[PDB]
């Protein structure tokens, strides 16, 4: 599923990811359109080998089980497929995880790049959530 601007947002928010360890829910909306531009079913391949999936195009080296990624840890406890379900649930449960994880948003490189110190508010703007 491609989801919308102000749908994400609201889904997101529902699922309780607005300001969740500090980060404002315009942070998240920002992350999904330049990892995935909304779309629940998008995958890309790493040069390691390992795999993102998803509209948060979480890592299979760490986060998920692929089944091809040796040495994957898993942390998460779901196989990656589950990450591309147009219920965003399970991939919102494991991205909490990793920002929990310490380093914060930076975990997701477009993020970092392309959100991070702009006014990441105007993702939201004219939304009813």
């Known amino acids: 599923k491609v989801f919308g601007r102000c749908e994400l947002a609201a889904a997101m ?11 404002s829910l315009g942070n998240w909306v920002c992350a999904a359109k330049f990892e995935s ?57 494991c991205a909490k995880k990793i920002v929990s994880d310490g380093n914060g948003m930076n975990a997701w490189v477009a993020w970092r790049n392309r959100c991070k110190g702009t006014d990441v508010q105007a993702w939201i703007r004219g939304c009813r959530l």
């Open 37 to 93: 531009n909304f779309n629940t079913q998008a995958t890309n391949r790493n040069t390691d080998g390992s795999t993102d999936y998803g509209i948060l195009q979480i890592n299979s080296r760490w986060w998920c089980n692929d089944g091809r990624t040796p040495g994957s840890r898993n942390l998460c406890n779901i196989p990656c497929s589950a990450l591309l379900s147009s219920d965003i649930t399970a991939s919102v449960n």
């Open 13 to 23: 928010k529902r699922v309780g990811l607005d300001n969740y360890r500090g980060y």
